[PDB]
Amino acid sequence: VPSWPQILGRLTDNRDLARGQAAWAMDQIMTGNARPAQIAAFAVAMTMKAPTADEVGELAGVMLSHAHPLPADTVPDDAVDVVGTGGDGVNTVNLSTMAAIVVAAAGVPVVKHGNRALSGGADTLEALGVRIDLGPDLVARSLAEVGIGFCFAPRFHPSYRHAAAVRREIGVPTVFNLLGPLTNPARPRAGLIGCAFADLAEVMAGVFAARRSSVLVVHGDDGLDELTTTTTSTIWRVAAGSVDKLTFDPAGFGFARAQLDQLAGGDAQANAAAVRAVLGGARGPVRDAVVLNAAGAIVAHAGLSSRAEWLPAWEEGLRRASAAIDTGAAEQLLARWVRFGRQIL
Amino acid sequence: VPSWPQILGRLTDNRDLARGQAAWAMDQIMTGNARPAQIAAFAVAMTMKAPTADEVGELAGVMLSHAHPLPADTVPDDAVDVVGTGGDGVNTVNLSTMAAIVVAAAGVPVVKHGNRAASSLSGGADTLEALGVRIDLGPDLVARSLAEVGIGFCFAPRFHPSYRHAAAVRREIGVPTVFNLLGPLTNPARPRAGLIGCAFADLAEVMAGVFAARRSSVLVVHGDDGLDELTTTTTSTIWRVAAGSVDKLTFDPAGFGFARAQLDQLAGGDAQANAAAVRAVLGGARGPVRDAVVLNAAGAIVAHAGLSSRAEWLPAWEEGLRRASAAIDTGAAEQLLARWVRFGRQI
Ligand SMILES: O=P(O)(O)OC[C@H]1O[C@H](OP(=O)(O)OP(=O)(O)O)[C@H](O)[C@@H]1O
Ligand SMILES: O=P(O)(O)OC[C@H]1O[C@H](OP(=O)(O)OP(=O)(O)O)[C@H](O)[C@@H]1O
Ligand SMILES: Cc1cccc(C(=O)O)c1N
Ligand SMILES: Cc1cccc(C(=O)O)c1N
Ligand SMILES: [Mg+2]
Ligand SMILES: [Mg+2]
Ligand SMILES: [Mg+2]
């Protein structure tokens, strides 16, 4: 029978947990029965031991079981997420958020997941006039009417508040930093998932493989939790319940090498202007990075329905993303999204 | 500029801390400025990194800086402690506590640091209390005990009030951490000699390193069966500390004529059962428990001899064993316990 001394003792001995132990720990955490000290000890010990896919799957599954779901039959079974763990410590413009808009504008339903954070995805969306803190019924309506929705994490995962407080108190990255992308309450079966931590990307890929999701888990070799234009990236291609590990070089599709500071973000208003520039069709490294990540999500989406050759999949993804911007569709989609939120009153 | 994210990040990156960082952390903990989550994260991360002697010395040093001291000039320069980390998981009779009484009865000043059980049925403090010894005395009365009886007991919660935040976290998480090492290293009377048991084979050397940076003569001991005492069931590893250096060796009590015992023969029970075992040994009962008590008492007498160190290792052991046995057989140990009980009752 499970207890903190047993579970923490096992982890401090550098041993993987027994089946069900991580799940028990997470139900204690999610029910308010874990003391902050227990939560912190578990988070740290799991991290230093090095979590397995099975363990993280238990944590995520339990957390999801406590989440508010979207209403039945409201999420298309081909919806995608575009999201990363964050914590790359580089402060870029909101690449995942821009890519999400472009992906949705290319005709792929997008359901994003997150929290207010210089400027996180959510904060930038608010600066653009998007309403981010909507309940399940309204996110469902948004997805139907606009092609995109946003699940505000504190609203969907209220029972995570004990863990979230501990995470702030200790500051340091832990296994808990992995859970965001794995606990999207709309349960999209495809995604482009960034991981700031190189070894943990493989673990996240394993969890998606166990779910039979179609996902690209990506880590820029400059340490970004996005597909980068500044260097090569590592991609774990998850499809058919199997993980394929690949090096990805954007130079192969004709992208010039950018510098990290060309992707630097600022406060919410600065990042909002960046979004507007890219959707208005401005060329440069920000567009290039957006188009790259949008294409990755489109490739992952394609993987739900077919196994297509990697390189042609990418060529079509890049083309779809470029056209979504250049036809005005992406700019129009953001306007529609703002319009939707203003209609709620 | 020190901070929790900086220090925790370093530890989770498996890196030793910079000089002063462990001390900063410990002072935050001891002043009530660390959140329980920060205390737990620190303890666990330090444990999994593997603490160094320098880091543990900072932790213990800071903890001592917040302790109540004994009054000036009340601890003899040659006082000895006999105490371990506990946590060996065996639930034995209280070997350190019996040894301490025997050592005091042999004429060596003893100032014992101790505490209730953490995961055993009866800790040394519990057993002492069951024997009628007063465990809850303050600095002045501990000093009087030492002068009038030849032994005193510093009850950790009375001498280390500021450790309450750390203690509570330790109980909430259960798992042993670097904090389990600190009890033997923070005797508030600061005796210069000691027989110090460590249940964690990997960390005994670290504890020895901490003592080597002090003006100390100590035997840090780990039974090769896992006991945080010198064992009679097999060999023990001893880290001998003196003059700022460490001499690691394998010790075998069969060399002194001790028969090999089985661990179950050293098994304890509740405070009442463990108090009964004390009375049996001090009354002259022969057997495995006596043997282990005599062995550990002698070990403490050897550490004490290492302070004003004429004697070489082997002759020191021979004399320690003679003195420890004689303290029991002449009734001196039984008499000294009665005297310690009388002292506490005379208020
Ligand atoms: O502050 P950090 O921990 O570095 O994280 C920066 C952002 O990255 C993640 O979001 P997401 O990938 O959805 O948004 P973005 O890429 O558009 O910023 C995370 O939810 C934050 O919004
Ligand atoms: O419950 P545990 O964690 O196993 O610890 C058992 C005892 O070990 C330590 O004492 P000490 O060495 O002073 O006493 P003893 O050897 O006489 O029991 C500790 O202060 C406990 O009292
Ligand atoms: C994801 C999440 C869920 C619930 C509460 C919080 C919080 O920051 O308190 C949070 N960050
Ligand atoms: C050593 C010590 C100091 C202060 C409080 C406690 C406690 O157990 O609560 C304690 N164990
Ligand atoms: Mg991102
Ligand atoms: Mg002991
Ligand atoms: Mg012991």
Swiss-Prot record, chain B:
<keyword id="KW-0460">Magnesium</keyword>
<keyword id="KW-0057">Aromatic amino acid biosynthesis</keyword>
<dbReference type="InterPro" id="IPR035902">
    <property type="entry name" value="Nuc_phospho_transferase"/>
</dbReference>
<feature type="binding site">
    <location>
        <position position="115"/>
    </location>
    <ligand>
        <name>anthranilate 1</name>
    </ligand>
</feature>
<dbReference type="GO" id="GO:0005829">
    <property type="term" value="C:cytosol"/>
</dbReference>
<feature type="binding site">
    <location>
        <begin position="87"/>
        <end position="88"/>
    </location>
    <ligand>
        <name>5-phospho-alpha-D-ribose 1-diphosphate</name>
    </ligand>
</feature>
<dbReference type="InterPro" id="IPR000312">
    <property type="entry name" value="Glycosyl_Trfase_fam3"/>
</dbReference>
<feature type="binding site">
    <location>
        <position position="124"/>
    </location>
    <ligand>
        <name>5-phospho-alpha-D-ribose 1-diphosphate</name>
    </ligand>
</feature>
<dbReference type="InterPro" id="IPR017459">
    <property type="entry name" value="Glycosyl_Trfase_fam3_N_dom"/>
</dbReference>
<dbReference type="GO" id="GO:0000287">
    <property type="term" value="F:magnesium ion binding"/>
</dbReference>
<dbReference type="InterPro" id="IPR005940">
    <property type="entry name" value="Anthranilate_Pribosyl_Tfrase"/>
</dbReference>
<keyword id="KW-0479">Metal-binding</keyword>
<keyword id="KW-0328">Glycosyltransferase</keyword>
<dbReference type="GO" id="GO:0000162">
    <property type="term" value="P:L-tryptophan biosynthetic process"/>
</dbReference>
<feature type="binding site">
    <location>
        <position position="228"/>
    </location>
    <ligand>
        <name>Mg(2+) 2</name>
    </ligand>
</feature>
<feature type="binding site">
    <location>
        <position position="84"/>
    </location>
    <ligand>
        <name>anthranilate 1</name>
    </ligand>
</feature>
<feature type="binding site">
    <location>
        <position position="92"/>
    </location>
    <ligand>
        <name>5-phospho-alpha-D-ribose 1-diphosphate</name>
    </ligand>
</feature>
<feature type="binding site">
    <location>
        <position position="84"/>
    </location>
    <ligand>
        <name>5-phospho-alpha-D-ribose 1-diphosphate</name>
    </ligand>
</feature>
<dbReference type="InterPro" id="IPR036320">
    <property type="entry name" value="Glycosyl_Trfase_fam3_N_dom_sf"/>
</dbReference>
<comment type="subunit">
    <text>Homodimer.</text>
</comment>
<feature type="binding site">
    <location>
        <position position="229"/>
    </location>
    <ligand>
        <name>Mg(2+) 1</name>
    </ligand>
</feature>
<comment type="similarity">
    <text>Belongs to the anthranilate phosphoribosyltransferase family.</text>
</comment>
<feature type="binding site">
    <location>
        <begin position="94"/>
        <end position="97"/>
    </location>
    <ligand>
        <name>5-phospho-alpha-D-ribose 1-diphosphate</name>
    </ligand>
</feature>
<comment type="pathway">
    <text>Amino-acid biosynthesis; L-tryptophan biosynthesis; L-tryptophan from chorismate: step 2/5.</text>
</comment>
<keyword id="KW-0808">Transferase</keyword>
<keyword id="KW-0028">Amino-acid biosynthesis</keyword>
<feature type="binding site">
    <location>
        <position position="229"/>
    </location>
    <ligand>
        <name>Mg(2+) 2</name>
    </ligand>
</feature>
<feature type="binding site">
    <location>
        <begin position="112"/>
        <end position="120"/>
    </location>
    <ligand>
        <name>5-phospho-alpha-D-ribose 1-diphosphate</name>
    </ligand>
</feature>
<comment type="function">
    <text>Catalyzes the transfer of the phosphoribosyl group of 5-phosphorylribose-1-pyrophosphate (PRPP) to anthranilate to yield N-(5'-phosphoribosyl)-anthranilate (PRA).</text>
</comment>
<dbReference type="Pfam" id="PF00591">
    <property type="entry name" value="Glycos_transf_3"/>
</dbReference>
<dbReference type="GO" id="GO:0004048">
    <property type="term" value="F:anthranilate phosphoribosyltransferase activity"/>
</dbReference>
<feature type="binding site">
    <location>
        <position position="170"/>
    </location>
    <ligand>
        <name>anthranilate 2</name>
    </ligand>
</feature>
<protein>
    <recommendedName>
        <fullName>Anthranilate phosphoribosyltransferase</fullName>
        <ecNumber>2.4.2.18</ecNumber>
    </recommendedName>
</protein>
<feature type="binding site">
    <location>
        <position position="96"/>
    </location>
    <ligand>
        <name>Mg(2+) 1</name>
    </ligand>
</feature>
<keyword id="KW-0822">Tryptophan biosynthesis</keyword>
<dbReference type="Pfam" id="PF02885">
    <property type="entry name" value="Glycos_trans_3N"/>
</dbReference>
